[PDB]
Structures are given as structure tokens and as C-alpha cells.
């Protein structure tokens, strides 16, 4: 099921990754590195630990601020907070499977795939 | 005197057992860090008074 | 038998007297996660006010979140450094990018709780 | 300076032909554990389903999942192994291995034969219960693991490589097979493990994508102290499968001690001892003389109790160390000689305690 | 009545990259040693130099004066170790080797390669902290002994006439290379003497005297325990040799006991742990696993005090066993479960023990 | 109920030349045995009685009485041990084994040739008592059965099968040969076992039947701490053989514990040790590091006494450990340090204990 607060952080309820560099080999494929929110180790979306998101055993997200997110997060993210310091705001957007073409951003009710995502 | 001390024995088990997680901020995504930590402010209708001291507070008085 | 000089090694019960017996990282507020309790602020120097205060509601409805200035940040790691963020906004990115959301966390582990088969804990 | 450690026992047995026993094993331990690293908790499966009486064949799954200093452990294997003759035996099976964020899958096509260097009738004729049988195993081994990552390939190319300009890798490689403190397990058992022969390092295509396979053959030679070689016979009742056998296990393991839990029926728990007494299965030898290895390493005071239950009608004629107490049926050993036995057999002691039941 | 043993620790690191750490041990124990003469006193001296930061060449000189059963034995080398590549480092050095009476000296031409039988990415990435790593090390060796003594001649005689006549002299030669208990040692560690090599056995003229040669070549395998091969390139920090790096120690052994001194500073004390976190360098392996081979004969009581000293403004985030107490900077071990470790890691365990500080 | 053990020596010395000492041991221990099968008692006879004096042979016997598991289990050897020069040494003997029903005889020619890797006169010179000498031992054997039983010929045939069907014969008898725990005990002594080596197998006809008779070569080589090899001239004293000497042992074991007796003279007990000075020979190391084996398996507390009788004028110059109490000519032994030491030696210590007795 769930491990117990005092496994790993308690403030997470799955662990919990996050994708810190997108670059692009000479082929063009999208090699995602992500860490873990404790941060010791390198991992990249293999089946085997893509096998997890399905059953909810982790959660990724990825950073506003990244230094390669390809699209122009800030703007859009300026939009919102003046429709309802602003500059400065950070999020965490959380990545999902989608069977059809892998991990995918729902970023402003319009679905997003890593490599189009990302430069 | 079963009542009075079934009532501070409350924030007693309190402090035994949520020193730094509880079932609520568990649910919340919330870390107590500390033992002498006054809220987290006015979010969530506010959450003051959780930490172990103000807990041993509530049992004293 | 010679011996080569001794070694003064008094350890155990012995009349002798014993012995006293740079802008490299960077800091971030997770906005969504950021309840506003302001604890990160107040470990900013007050000659560098790089965390604020971002109003858009009622405090009582998550109205108010925190953030850190990057133009006026200098990465002295006082905000990080004590563990006062509970909700994990709170985060740092080092020089190569790795994302930690606290300063260590706990190990991993699975969880059973041990019975006996004749002692009080039984089954 | 002595740590305490708090253990409980108990075998339920049936009457008749029956050799099914049901094992409950509980541990308790304060002293830190041998592992460099920590903590290291483990939960394993295994599940015995007989597929058909005639053929003799029977389903075996083993699921194994460890979290190793944060690090997520499992491997699956699910096997069909059959009795062919007195000394060969063939398993096919299948098993995946996932460490992290890495894993792959494999299949075999396998068959183990054990011979024994003497066979004299006298040996059989003067020696009522004998424990030691000097022997040799021999496994022929087909993986076929497909090379679906990037690394899988590398360590395959790295192994062909490593084949081709070295000429010591039969020899070598028993370095890499048994890692750390798996070496020296090897002469703790008065095992000896010969050097591999790669029959074949082959890539053929599979659906999936391209398989690296390997056919390998090896042999190990026991002493008579290994149990797989001196009891062949006694480690598969396949026969004795008339229902499905299960046996579940698993243990938490940290700087503070450790914390075992033990589960399981199967068939094999008691074996004829002649005269028409029955008898419970000898203790294997490998497990003991492997846990002298980690066992010895801090002072310990033992406190543990084994509660045998026999059936309707069946009365203990002798055992040693003899059981403390009594309650009809089921007869309790604790204290005295037998924890003094248990402080034998957990720093690597083999000392025979035989239980003999007669109807 | 009861035996018992007293030791104090100590170690103080530096801020920023700083890999710089003070060590300071002092230790005393009831108990007799081993070894079958006494009484065995010895000194031991340690001393590296940095030569030139862009060669990466150092000199490192070693003195040992120990006296056993009134046999005055000293041993004294110097040479010049530099990192060639990540698996070849050539050392150049020059020592005297006396005994009693007896003295003879030699010049060393020599280089060592060390190679991992597999280098995966995902073992790294999945890995934070990989304490078996599995290996092999090839020694090239040049000897130059001069023959000055009556005594030299005839061993240089006899060794000659034995390898033309026995066949078996590489593989007999391990049986007088590791000499009584060290060979034992050698199954302890899962460590493999590879038979050695005789490049050439000439005797070449020098301006003092006739000066037998011997060219051989050996290699040895580790099955991941031997730190030498699974830490390379932690044993030599020779580019962190900013300023000269000393280790000085020292025991008196005999019936009644021995005594222990030993103090010193060198960089690797400190090495990255990942997310900005520094630790303590893990444990070696072998000199645990070498110290369970004589610590385990007598039952003794723990009296061990481990004071660690961290830099202004760096705090510890993590340590099991926890510190008994903290005193402003310094942090302090005694008791419980740290002087439960000590009793586990003084008769062979090797279980970890972790500290991570962070700034 | 505790870990308790009881005992008891005695070593009496005569005066001038001799080196005949009167030893007796009697030790009581309440841990179960590590032996698989209990209840197992054995007695054993050595008796020495020499042939003539110019030659220097002697003619040995040892009878060996053992009841294992109920099985009654008997060896008989009666032998002719010569000194042929200092490597080689010719033994012709003949002896019965009988297993319950099952027994058969054998005579054998055998020579045993012994070499150390190297004779330095500095080693001599500079250490008076050296303890560890690295050297190998050659056995030539000729055994000869008379195969007079159906299980006798059975085993005879089978073997000539195997050697002409197994390629691996030399390799694969040595895990045959040392059963059970036998064979873990080569590593731990620091000694290797070569391969057999086969002159012939060949049947040839007796008077009373067809008797198998084997002609065989093996080696063995110790890295110093094997006694065989270390001290060969010291474990036969034949030349100081004047009268003959027996030694005479047996003991008792099952889930209780242990219960030893041993008495007998014979010449080598005591040796000069320079100075005009004598000394008790220096205790064996195989059996030390044999018993570290099993002696490790439980805690206990120790009450050993040694009674140490010396000749009338002879006082000690020096011991370690001290005796407790010195009643004029009789010293004794008991507590303190010396009850430490034989908690170090019983669980596998060989520390040096050294008593120098001079007129
Ligand atoms: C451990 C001592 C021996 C050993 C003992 C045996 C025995 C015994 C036999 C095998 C046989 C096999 N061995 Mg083998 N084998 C060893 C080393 C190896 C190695 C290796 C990595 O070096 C390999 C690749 C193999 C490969 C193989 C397979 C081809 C085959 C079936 C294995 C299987 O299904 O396991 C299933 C996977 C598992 C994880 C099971 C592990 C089970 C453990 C060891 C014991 C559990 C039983 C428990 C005590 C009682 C449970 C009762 C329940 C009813 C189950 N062996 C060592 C040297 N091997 C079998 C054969 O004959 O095939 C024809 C068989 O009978
Ligand atoms: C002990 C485990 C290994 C071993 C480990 C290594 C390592 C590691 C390396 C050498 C390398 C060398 N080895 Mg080697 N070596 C072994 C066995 C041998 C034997 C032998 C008698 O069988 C020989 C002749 C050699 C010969 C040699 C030299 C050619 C060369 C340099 C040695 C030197 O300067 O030592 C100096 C003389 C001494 C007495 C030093 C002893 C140091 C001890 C062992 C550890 C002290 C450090 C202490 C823990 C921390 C101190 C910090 C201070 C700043 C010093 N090795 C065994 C099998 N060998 C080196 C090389 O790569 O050359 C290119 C090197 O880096
Ligand atoms: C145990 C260590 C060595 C060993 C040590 C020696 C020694 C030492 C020598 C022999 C020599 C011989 N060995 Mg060998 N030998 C070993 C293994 C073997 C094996 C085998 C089964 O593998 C065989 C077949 C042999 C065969 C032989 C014979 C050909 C020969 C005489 C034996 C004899 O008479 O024993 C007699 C039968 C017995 C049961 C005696 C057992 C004695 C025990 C071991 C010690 C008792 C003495 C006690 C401590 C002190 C007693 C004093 C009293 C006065 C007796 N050896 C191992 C490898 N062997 C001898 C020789 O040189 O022949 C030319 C000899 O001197
Ligand atoms: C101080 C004395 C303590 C004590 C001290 C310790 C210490 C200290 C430690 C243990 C450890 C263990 N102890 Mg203990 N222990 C005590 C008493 C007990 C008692 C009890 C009271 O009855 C129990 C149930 C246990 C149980 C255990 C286990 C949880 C554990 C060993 C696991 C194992 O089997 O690995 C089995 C291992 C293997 C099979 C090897 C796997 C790897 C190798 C390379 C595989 C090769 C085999 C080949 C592939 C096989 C076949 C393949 C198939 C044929 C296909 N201990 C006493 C009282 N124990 C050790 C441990 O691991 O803790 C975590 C440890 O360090
Ligand atoms: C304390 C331990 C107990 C003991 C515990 C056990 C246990 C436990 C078991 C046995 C078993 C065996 N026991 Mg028992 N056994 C003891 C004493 C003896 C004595 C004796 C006269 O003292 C004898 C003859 C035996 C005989 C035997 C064998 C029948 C059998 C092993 C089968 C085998 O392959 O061996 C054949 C012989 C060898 C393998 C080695 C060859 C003999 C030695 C190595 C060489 C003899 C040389 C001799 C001195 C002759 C002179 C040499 C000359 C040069 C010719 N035991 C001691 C006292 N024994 C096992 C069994 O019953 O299985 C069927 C078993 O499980
Ligand atoms: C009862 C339990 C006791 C205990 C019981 C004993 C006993 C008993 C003994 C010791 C011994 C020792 N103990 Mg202790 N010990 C205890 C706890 C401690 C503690 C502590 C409290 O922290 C300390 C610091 C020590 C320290 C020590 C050492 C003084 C000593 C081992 C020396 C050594 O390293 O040789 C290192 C040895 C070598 C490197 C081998 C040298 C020879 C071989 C042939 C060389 C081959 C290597 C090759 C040439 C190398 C490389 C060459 C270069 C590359 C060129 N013990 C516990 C509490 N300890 C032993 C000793 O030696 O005492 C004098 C001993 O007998
Ligand atoms: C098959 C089990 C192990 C393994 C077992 C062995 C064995 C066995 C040997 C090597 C040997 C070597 N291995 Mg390989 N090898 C592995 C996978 C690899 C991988 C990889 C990318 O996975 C790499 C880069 C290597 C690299 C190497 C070389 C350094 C070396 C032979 C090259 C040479 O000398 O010319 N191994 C796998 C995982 N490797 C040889 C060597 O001598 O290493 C020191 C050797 O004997
Ligand atoms: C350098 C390492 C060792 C050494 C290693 C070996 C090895 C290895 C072997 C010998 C062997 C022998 N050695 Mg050498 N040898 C050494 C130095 C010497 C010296 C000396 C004067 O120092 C002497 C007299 C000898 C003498 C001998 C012979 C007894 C024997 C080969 C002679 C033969 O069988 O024809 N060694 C040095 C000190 N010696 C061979 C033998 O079988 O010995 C029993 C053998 O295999
Ligand atoms: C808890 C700690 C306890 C302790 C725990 C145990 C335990 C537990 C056991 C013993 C065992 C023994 N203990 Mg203890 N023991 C203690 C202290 C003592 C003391 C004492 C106080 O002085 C004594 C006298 C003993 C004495 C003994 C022996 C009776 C016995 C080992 C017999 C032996 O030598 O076999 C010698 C064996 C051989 C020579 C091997 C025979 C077989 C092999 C295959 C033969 C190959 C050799 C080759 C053929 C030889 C040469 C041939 C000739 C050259 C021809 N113990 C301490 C206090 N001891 C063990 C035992 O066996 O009990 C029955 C055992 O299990
Ligand atoms: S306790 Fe109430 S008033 Fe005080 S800080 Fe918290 S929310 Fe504000
Ligand atoms: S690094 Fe220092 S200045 Fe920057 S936000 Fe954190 S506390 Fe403030
Ligand atoms: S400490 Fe955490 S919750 Fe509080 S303002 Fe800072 S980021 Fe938000």
C-alpha cells in the first residue's frame, strides 16, 4: 500500500521525484533525469519505474524556474496571478502517464509531452 | 477525578504519540519540526497551539 | 627482554588525571505547497530582503504564500539551513541542479509489527 | 555486557502416512546486524502447488522484496521442477529482477544432477541415521534475458568483451558470483565451487527486441556437510504434495537488531527414524554453520521457547534435550539444556536434539 | 576477574573542500595477544610530501622499529607514488630491511593496475553510498637487493637453484610469502593470491658489490572486501596534499596486554555524501575484517569515548549510533548503543555507522 | 545451569638430559557437543616401545574405541616408524576397521619426506625460539586390502570405474576425504591439501583372496602453523626413546557435554631453550586453531588448575602467566591470568605461555 510517516519524509504520502535537466542527446531523444525529493541519486524514466506511477507508488513534478522548460512558463504564469511578488512565484506542475505517448504536462487544459515540453 | 484525569491524560497521549506527525497533518502534507513552534498562521481556518509544549500548556491548565 | 620507550596510554583506573571526562545554490518557494507561516523569512538577513509576502485573499483560505527575490537573494542558505518549513516549499537546487526538499530525510523501509507465538503479544 | 534476544517455536504434525508439519518461528534480537549497510528489511514468499500425481511435476514461486538502505530490492522467480531420475532433476521457470528504477527478466531451461562418490550397502546396514553423505552437483543452465535497456546491453558486450581477451574468466568470475562475505560462506561449508564452462554466449532475436543467451554449465562439491548434496531426496517431496504448500518469512534489520517473522506448512517435517517411530526432520547444517558466520559477534542471553503439538494418540519415546513441561498432547521445551542448545546452534553449533513420536 | 578495555577517539575537520581531518586514538586491553611470542613491542611512522601539484607525484616514508622477544626488526622505506591513470600508478622507491645483526637494503621499480570487472551506469545511479565494488590488482615489481652478505649470496643461491629444480615454485611461493597466520588471512578478507610471475631472476653488477635481480609480476583479486582494490582512488588523495600529511602510531604487546597510540592528519577523512551533504569516510573493511581474526579469544568489556570536532557553522543531520551528547561544536559517543558497535566492530563486524554534517 | 567447565593438569619433569615428562589432563564441560549425531564416546591408546637403538626405529600402535549413535566403530593401527635422514621417514604398518558387521584390514609401505622453502642461518641467529616455518610434506603410500566381503569388492570395483570414467579423479577425492567439517578445517590451520596423485590400482592375488592394492603419492604443504611440517623433528623422539611410552585419552559426549581424560609419558616435553636453561615445548598450534573450531558456540566461565612438578635443584626463571601459588618443587596454575589464557586458547588463541626452568 503506502509506507508510514516515519519512512522517507512524512509530509509525502508517495515518494516523490522531480525532473532537475532535459537535454537532448545528438539523436534528439529527450534524456529526463529526475531525482528524488531527498536528492542522492540520478534516475531516468525507465518502464520499470514508470510501472510504479501507474500504481501510485511516486509522483513527479517538474519546477517553473527550470533553466530549460522550452515553453514561456513565466508569462502565462504572470496572466493568472494578476486575473485573480508576482514575478517571483514558483510551481510544481505534476506529471502523469499517458498510455498514448508517456509522461505528459495537463498545463492550462491542454496536454503536453515531455519532449514537446521540454527544449 | 477519572473524568479529570481521563480529560488531561487526552493531551497527554497527545504528545506521546504526534510529536511530529498527526492523522490531520498527515492528511494536511504538514511537518511539526519543532517542539515549541506557536501555528503555521491562519490557513486551513488556522492551526494554532499543535506543537508538544503548547500540548504540555492544555494539560496543565 | 628489551622494550622500545614506553607509551603514556593511562585509560582506565590510573592516579593520572583525563582529558574534560558565494552564490553557487539557490533557494525556492513551492507556491501550491507554501502555507505562509513566514518562518523562512525571518532567517533572511534584514539587510537582504529577499523573501516577501504575495497577497490575493483571505489568510484564512490560503490567501497569503511566500517567495524568495532572486535579484536581491544571496544564497547565504540561513532560510534552508534550519529545518522550519513544514509542508516542503521550502526547497534548494545545487550548483548541478539536484532538488532537495528538506536537509535529510529519513531512510526508507517496510513496515510489519513482530507477535509471538506464547508471550503477551500473541498471534 | 550481554544483550537479550526473545525467540518462539511451534510444529503441529499429522498422524498416519502424513510428513505435513506446520512451522510458526518468531525472533526477536538487540544486537546490530553483520550488513555494512542499514537498515535492511526483507518479506520472502514461497508457494508449492503439485500439477500433476503421475508426472511428478509441481509449481514453485519465490517473490522477494527487500528495501536495502532505501533502495527498493525485488526479485521474482516462478519455476516447474520435476523429478527425472535418482540423481537428475529439470526445472523450467521464469523470474524478473528490478533494483530501483532498473530491471530485467530472464527464463530458463535448467537440469541439476547429483551424484554421491560412494554407495555401500554397509554404510546403510550399520549406520541407523546418517548425517554426513559426501557428493557433487552439476547444473546446466539456458538464460534468455532480453537486452531492453541501454545498461543490459553494456554488460553483455562487457561480458563478451571480458571473455575474449581474458583468458582466466572460468576462474574469476566465482570472484564476482559470490560477492563480499559470500566468498568465504564457500569454505564455511566445506563447499567448493568449481569453475563455470560457458557453452554458448549467443544474441538471438526475440519479438520484444534482441535476447542475449547464455548456456552455461558448473559444478559444486559438498564435503557431506551441504545439505542440497547430502539430503537431494529429503529437499523436494514433490510426492507428497497432495495439497498446495506454502512457506512465508520476512525480517526488519537496522543499527538496533532485528526482527524476524516465520511461516508455513509443507510436507517433509517428519520422516520414519524405523522400529515404527517417527521423527522430526534433522536440522539442516548449511543454515547453522552459515548463521556461526554473523551469529558470533556479540554476547547474547537466550530466551526462547518451542511448543511441538503431535497427533491424537502420539507420544513422545525420547528426545534430547528432554521438554521442561508437558500439556497432553503438546509437550513445551524453554530453559535449562535446550537454551543452552539454542546458544549452540545460533553462534554455529550442529549438536543432534532428536524428538522420536511413536503411535 | 572480568576483562576490560579503555580506548578514547578523536577527529577534527575543516570547513569548505577542505578534505583535511585530525584522527587521535588511544586504546588498552587486558587481554594476551596473539601472537606466540612476547613480548612484541612496535613504532610506526607515516609521512607524505607533495612534490609538484601538476606531476600529482608525493613522497611517502615509513619507519618501523619493533622489537620482538628482544629481536630488534626495523623495516624503512621511501618512495615516490604518482597517479598515472584511473587504474595505473608507478611508484619509484628505495628501503632497508634489518634484523638483529642482519641488515640488507633494496630499490624498487614498480607500478600497480587495478580494473573493476564491470562499470555500470545503473549500479551508480541507483547507489548513493556503494561500499562492495568488485575488482582485481597486477604489481610489476623490479627488486635491486645488493649481495653484500655471506648470508644474501646463499638465499640468492638457493632461490635460483630451487626454481630451476621445482616446478611448482609460483604456486609454493604464496606458502612463504604469507607466513603462519597471514595466509589464514587471506580466505578471511575474500581476498585471491594469484601464483606469481619471474620476469627474470639476473644478477647485474653494481659499483659496491654483485646486486642480484628480480623482475616478477603478480595479481590479486578482491571479491569486493579488499579496500584496496574497491577503494582505489580514496587511499591516495595526493592532488587534496596541499601541505605534508603525517600518521604516527605505536603499541607495547605482551602476556598482561597491549597498548595503543596512535595520531596523525590526512584529507579523505571527508568526503561528499550528495545534496550538499558532507560524511565521514566509511569504515575500511579489511583491517575490521583482519581484527575479527584475533579479537574474538577473549570475552571483554567496552569503555570507548568518541569525540568528533566539526568546523564553525557545520552541524550534524543525521548520525546512527546518535551521539550520547553535544557540546557546542563537539559531539560526543559513550555508551549504549556506540559501545555496542565497538563490541561489533572489534571482533570482526562491520556493521555502518554513519554521520553526516552539513554547513 | 550456567556455562560452567572444570579442569585439571599435571606435567612432572626429570632431571639432567631427559625430556621425559609425565602429563595428565582431566577436563568436565557442560555446552552440547557440535556434532550432528549424539550420544558419541571414544577412547584412544598410543603406545611406543622401541626396536633397537642403532637403527632408531620404534614400533607404535593406537587402538581407537568409539560407540557413534550406537554404532560401534573401531581403527586399529600397529606401525614400524624409522629415521631415514632429516626429510624422509619409511613407516611400515598394518592395521583393522570395523564399522558395526562391516570390517576390513590393510598393511601399508609408506615414506613421508619434508622440505622447508628455505634454510637462513640470519633467522637462526637472530630469533632464539622461532614458532611459525613455512615447508611442505610428501607421502608415498602402498595400501593393500584383502577384499574377503560382497561390500569390500563392491567399493573396490566402483572406484577404478570412476577413475576411468572422471577426468576430475585427483581433485574431487580431496572433498570425499576430509568429511563433513573436516575439510573447513584445511583453510583454518593454513593448510593446503595437493592433489592425489595414482601410481597404480592394481588387484593382485593373497593367499586368503583377492586383495586390492594401491599405490599413491600425495602432498601437503603448511604456511607455518601446520605442526607436521613446522616442528618434524620434534614430534619424534625416537632416539630418546629408552623405554616405551604410552599416552592414553578417551571421552564422553551427548546433549550434556563433555567429559575428557588423558594421562601418559613419553620424551619432548621438555626441550633446551639456550643459556643453560630448559622450557616446556611450545604448545601445538593445530590443535588450538582446530578447537577455535568448536569452542566458540558458547559462553563460559573457566576453573582450570595446572600442577607443574619440577626436578629436585630445579627452580623457574621466569613464567607468563605467573603462578598463582609455588609450593617449593611444585608450582601450580589457577585464576587470574591464566584462567584468561585458557579462555583464549580453548576458543582458538594460541598466545605463548612460557615457563624456563633452570638447575
Ligand atoms: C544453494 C545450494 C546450491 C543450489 C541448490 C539447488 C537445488 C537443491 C536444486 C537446484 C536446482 C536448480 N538450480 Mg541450483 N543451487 C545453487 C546455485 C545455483 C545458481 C547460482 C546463482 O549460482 C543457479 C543459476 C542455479 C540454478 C538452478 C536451476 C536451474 C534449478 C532450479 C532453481 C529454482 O527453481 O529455484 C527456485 C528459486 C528460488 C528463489 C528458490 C529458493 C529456495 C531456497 C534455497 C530454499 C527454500 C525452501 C525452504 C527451506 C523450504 C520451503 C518449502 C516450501 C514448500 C517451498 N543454482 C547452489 C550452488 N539448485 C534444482 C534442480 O534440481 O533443478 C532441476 C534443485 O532441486
Ligand atoms: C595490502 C594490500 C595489497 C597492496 C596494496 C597496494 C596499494 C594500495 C598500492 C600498492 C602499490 C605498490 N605495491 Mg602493493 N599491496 C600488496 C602487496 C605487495 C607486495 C608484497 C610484499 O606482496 C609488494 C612487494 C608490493 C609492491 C608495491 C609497490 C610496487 C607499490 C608501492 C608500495 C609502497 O610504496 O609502499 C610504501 C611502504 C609502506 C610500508 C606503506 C604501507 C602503508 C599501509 C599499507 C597503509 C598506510 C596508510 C594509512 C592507512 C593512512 C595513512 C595516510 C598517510 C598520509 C600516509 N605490494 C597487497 C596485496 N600496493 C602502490 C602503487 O599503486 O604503486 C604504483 C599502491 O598505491
Ligand atoms: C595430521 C597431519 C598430516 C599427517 C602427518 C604425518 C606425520 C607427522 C608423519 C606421518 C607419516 C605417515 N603418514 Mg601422514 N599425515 C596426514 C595424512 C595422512 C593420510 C591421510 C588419511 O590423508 C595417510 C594415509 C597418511 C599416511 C602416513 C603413513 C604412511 C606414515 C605413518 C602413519 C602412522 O603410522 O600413523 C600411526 C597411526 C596413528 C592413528 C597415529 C596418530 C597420531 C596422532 C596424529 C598424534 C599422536 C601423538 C600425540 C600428540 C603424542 C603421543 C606420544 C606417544 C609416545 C605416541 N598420512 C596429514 C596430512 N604423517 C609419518 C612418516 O613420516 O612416515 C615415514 C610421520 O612421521
Ligand atoms: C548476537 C547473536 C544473535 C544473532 C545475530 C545476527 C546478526 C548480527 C545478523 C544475523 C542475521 C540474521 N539472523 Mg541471526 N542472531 C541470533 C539468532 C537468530 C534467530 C533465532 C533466535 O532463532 C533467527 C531466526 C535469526 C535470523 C537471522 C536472519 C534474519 C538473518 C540471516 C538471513 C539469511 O538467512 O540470509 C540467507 C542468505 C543467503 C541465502 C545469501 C544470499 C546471497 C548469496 C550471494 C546467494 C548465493 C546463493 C545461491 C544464489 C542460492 C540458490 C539459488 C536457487 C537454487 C535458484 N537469528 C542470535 C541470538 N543474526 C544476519 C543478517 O543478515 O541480518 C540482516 C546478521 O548480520
Ligand atoms: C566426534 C565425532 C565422531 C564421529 C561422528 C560421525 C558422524 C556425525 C557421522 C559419522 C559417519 C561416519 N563414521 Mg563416525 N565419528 C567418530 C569416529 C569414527 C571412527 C573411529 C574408529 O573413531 C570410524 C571408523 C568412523 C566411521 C565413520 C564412517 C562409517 C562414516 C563416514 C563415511 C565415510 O565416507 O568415511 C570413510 C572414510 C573417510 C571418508 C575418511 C578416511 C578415514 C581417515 C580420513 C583416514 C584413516 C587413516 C587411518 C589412520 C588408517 C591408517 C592410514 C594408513 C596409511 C593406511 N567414525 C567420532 C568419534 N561419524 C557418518 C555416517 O554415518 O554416514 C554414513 C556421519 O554422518
Ligand atoms: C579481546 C578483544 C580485544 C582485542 C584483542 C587483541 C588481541 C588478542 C590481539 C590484538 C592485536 C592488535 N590489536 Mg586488538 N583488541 C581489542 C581492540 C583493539 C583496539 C580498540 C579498542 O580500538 C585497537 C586500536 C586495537 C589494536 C590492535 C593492534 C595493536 C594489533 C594488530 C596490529 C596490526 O594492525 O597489525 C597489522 C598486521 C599486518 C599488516 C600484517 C603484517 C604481516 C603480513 C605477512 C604482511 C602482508 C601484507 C603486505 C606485505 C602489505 C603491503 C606492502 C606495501 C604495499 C608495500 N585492538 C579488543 C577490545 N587485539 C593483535 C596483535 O598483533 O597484537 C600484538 C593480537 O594478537
Ligand atoms: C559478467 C559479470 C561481470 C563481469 C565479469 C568479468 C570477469 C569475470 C572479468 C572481467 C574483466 C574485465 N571487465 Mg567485465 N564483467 C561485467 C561487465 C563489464 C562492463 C559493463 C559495462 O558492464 C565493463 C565496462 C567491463 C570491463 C572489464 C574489463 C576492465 C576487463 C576485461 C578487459 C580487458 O582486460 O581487455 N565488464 C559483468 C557485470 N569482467 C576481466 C578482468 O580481468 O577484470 C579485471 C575478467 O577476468
Ligand atoms: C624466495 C622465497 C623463499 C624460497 C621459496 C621456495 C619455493 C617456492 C620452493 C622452494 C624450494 C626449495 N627451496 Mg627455496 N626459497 C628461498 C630460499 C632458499 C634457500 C636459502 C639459502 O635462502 C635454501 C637453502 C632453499 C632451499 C630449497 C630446497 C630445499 C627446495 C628446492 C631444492 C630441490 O628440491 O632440488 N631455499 C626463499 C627465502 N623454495 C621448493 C620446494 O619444494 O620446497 C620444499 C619450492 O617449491
Ligand atoms: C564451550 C567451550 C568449551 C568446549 C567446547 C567444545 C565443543 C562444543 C566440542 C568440543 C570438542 C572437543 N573438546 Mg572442547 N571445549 C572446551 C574445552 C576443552 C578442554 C579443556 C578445558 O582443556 C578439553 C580437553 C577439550 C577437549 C575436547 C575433545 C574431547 C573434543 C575434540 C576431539 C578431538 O581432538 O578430535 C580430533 C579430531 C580429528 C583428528 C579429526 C578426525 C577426522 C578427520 C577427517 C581426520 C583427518 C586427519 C588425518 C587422517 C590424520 C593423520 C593420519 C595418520 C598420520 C596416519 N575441550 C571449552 C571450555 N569442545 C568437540 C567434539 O568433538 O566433541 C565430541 C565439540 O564438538
Ligand atoms: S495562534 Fe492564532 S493568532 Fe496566534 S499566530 Fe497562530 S493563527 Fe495567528
Ligand atoms: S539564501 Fe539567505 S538571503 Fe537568500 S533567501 Fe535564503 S536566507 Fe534569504
Ligand atoms: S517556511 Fe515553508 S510554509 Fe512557511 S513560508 Fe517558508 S516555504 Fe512557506
Known amino acids: 500500500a503506502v509506507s508510514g510517516p516515519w519512512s522517507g519524509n512524512a509530509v509525502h504520502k508517495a515518494e516523490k521525484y522531480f525532473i532537475t535537466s532535459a537535454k537532448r542527446d545528438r539523436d534528439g531523444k529527450l534524456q529526463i533525469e529526475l531525482v528524488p525529493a531527498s536528492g542522492r541519486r540520478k534516475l531516468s524514466p525507465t518502464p520499470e519505474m514508470i510501472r510504479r506511477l501507474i500504481d501510485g507508488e511516486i509522483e513527479i513534478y517538474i519546477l517553473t524556474t527550470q533553466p530549460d522548460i522550452a515553453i514561456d512558463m513565466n508569462k502565462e504564469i504572470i496572466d493568472m496571478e494578476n486575473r485573480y511578488g508576482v514575478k517571483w512565484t514558483m510551481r510544481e506542475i505534476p506529471v502523469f502517464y499517458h498510455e498514448g505517448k508517456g509522461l505528459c504536462v495537463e498545463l492550462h487544459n491542454k496536454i503536453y509531452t515531455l519532449d514537446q515540453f521540454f527544449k | 477525578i477519572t473524568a479529570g484525569s481521563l480529560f488531561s491524560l487526552i493531551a497527554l497521549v497527545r504528545i506521546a504519540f504526534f510529536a511530529h506527525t498527526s492523522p490531520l497533518w498527515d492528511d494536511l502534507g504538514l511537518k511539526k519540526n519543532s517542539y515549541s513552534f506557536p501555528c503555521l498562521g491562519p490557513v486551513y481556518g488556522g492551526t494554532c497551539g499543535v506543537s508538544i509544549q503548547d500540548q504540555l500548556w492544555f494539560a496543565m491548565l | 627482554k628489551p622494550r622500545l620507550a614506553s607509551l603514556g596510554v593511562t585509560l582506565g583506573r590510573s592516579g593520572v588525571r583525563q582529558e574534560s571526562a558565494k552564490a553557487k545554490k539557490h533557494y525556492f518557494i513551492i507556491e501550491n505547497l507554501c502555507v505562509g507561516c513566514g518562518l523562512c523569512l525571518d532567517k533572511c538577513p534584514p539587510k537582504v530582503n529577499a523573501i516577501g509576502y504575495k497577497f490575493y485573499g483571505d489568510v484564512q483560505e490560503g490567501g497569503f504564500r511566500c517567495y524568495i527575490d532572486q535579484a536581491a537573494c544571496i544564497s547565504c542558505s540561513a532560510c534552508f539551513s534550519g529545518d522550519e518549513c513544514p509542508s516542503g516549499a521550502l526547497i534548494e537546487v545545487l550548483p548541478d541542479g539536484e532538488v532537495l526538499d528538506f536537509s535529510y530525510t529519513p531512510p526508507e523501509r517496510l513496515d510489519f509489527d513482530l507477535r509471538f507465538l506464547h508471550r503477551f503479544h500473541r498471534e | ?359
Open chain 4, 1 to 359: 555486557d550481554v544483550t537479550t534476544a526473545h525467540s518462539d517455536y511451534e510444529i503441529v504434525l499429522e498422524g498416519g502416512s502424513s510428513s505435513w508439519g506446520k512451522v510458526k518461528a518468531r525472533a526477536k534480537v538487540n544486537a546490530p546486524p553483520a550488513s555494512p549497510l542499514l537498515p535492511a528489511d526483507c518479506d520472502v514468499k514461497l508457494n508449492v502447488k503439485p500439477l500433476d500425481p503421475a508426472k511428478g511435476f509441481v509449481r514453485i514461486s519465490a517473490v522477494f522484496e527487500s528495501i536495502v538502505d532505501s533502495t527498493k530490492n525485488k526479485l521474482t522467480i516462478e519455476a516447474d521442477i520435476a523429478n527425472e531420475t535418482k540423481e537428475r532433476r529439470i526445472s523450467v521457470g521464469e523470474g524478473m529482477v528490478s533494483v530501483g528504477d532498473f530491471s530485467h527478466t530472464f527464463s530458463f531451461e535448467g537440469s541439476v544432477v547429483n551424484l554421491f562418490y560412494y554407495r555401500s550397502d554397509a554404510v546403510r546396514r550399520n549406520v541407523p541415521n546418517p548425517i554426513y553423505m559426501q557428493g557433487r552437483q552439476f547444473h546446466d543452465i539456458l538464460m534468455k534475458v532480453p537486452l531492453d535497456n541501454n545498461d543490459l546491453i553494456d554488460t553483455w558486450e562487457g561480458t563478451v568483451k571480458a571473455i575474449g581477451s581474458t583468458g582466466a574468466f572460468n576462474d574469476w568470475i566465482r570472484d564476482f558470483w559470490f560477492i563480499g562475505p559470500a566468498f568465504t560462506a564457500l569454505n564455511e561449508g566445506g563447499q567448493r565451487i568449481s569453475r563455470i564452462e560457458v557453452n554458448g554466449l549467443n544474441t538471438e532475436s526475440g519479438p520484444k527486441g534482441p535476447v542475449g543467451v547464455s548456456r552455461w554449465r558448473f559444478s559444486h562439491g559438498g564435503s557431506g556437510m551441504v545439505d542440497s548434496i547430502s539430503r537431494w531426496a529429503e529437499l523436494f517431496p514433490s510426492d507428497k504434495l497432495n495439497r498446495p504448500a506454502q512457506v512465508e518469512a520476512g525480517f526488519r534489520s537496522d543499527s538496533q537488531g532485528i526482527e524476524v517473522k516465520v511461516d508455513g506448512e509443507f510436507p517433509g517435517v517428519s520422516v520414519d527414524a524405523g522400529g515404527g517411530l517417527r521423527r522430526i526432520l534433522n536440522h539442516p547444517l548449511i543454515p547453522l554453520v552459515h548463521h556461526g558466520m554473523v551469529g558470533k559477534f556479540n554476547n547474547f542471553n537466550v530466551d526462547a521457547q518451542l511448543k511441538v503439538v503431535l497427533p491424537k494418540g502420539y507420544k513422545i519415546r525420547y528426545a534430547a534435550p528432554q521438554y521442561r513441561s508437558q500439556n497432553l498432547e503438546e509437550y513445551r521445551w524453554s530453559g535449562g539444556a535446550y537454551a543452552r542448545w539454542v546458544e549452540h546452534v545460533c553462534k554455529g553449533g550442529v549438536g543432534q536434539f532428536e524428538i522420536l513420536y511413536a503411535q
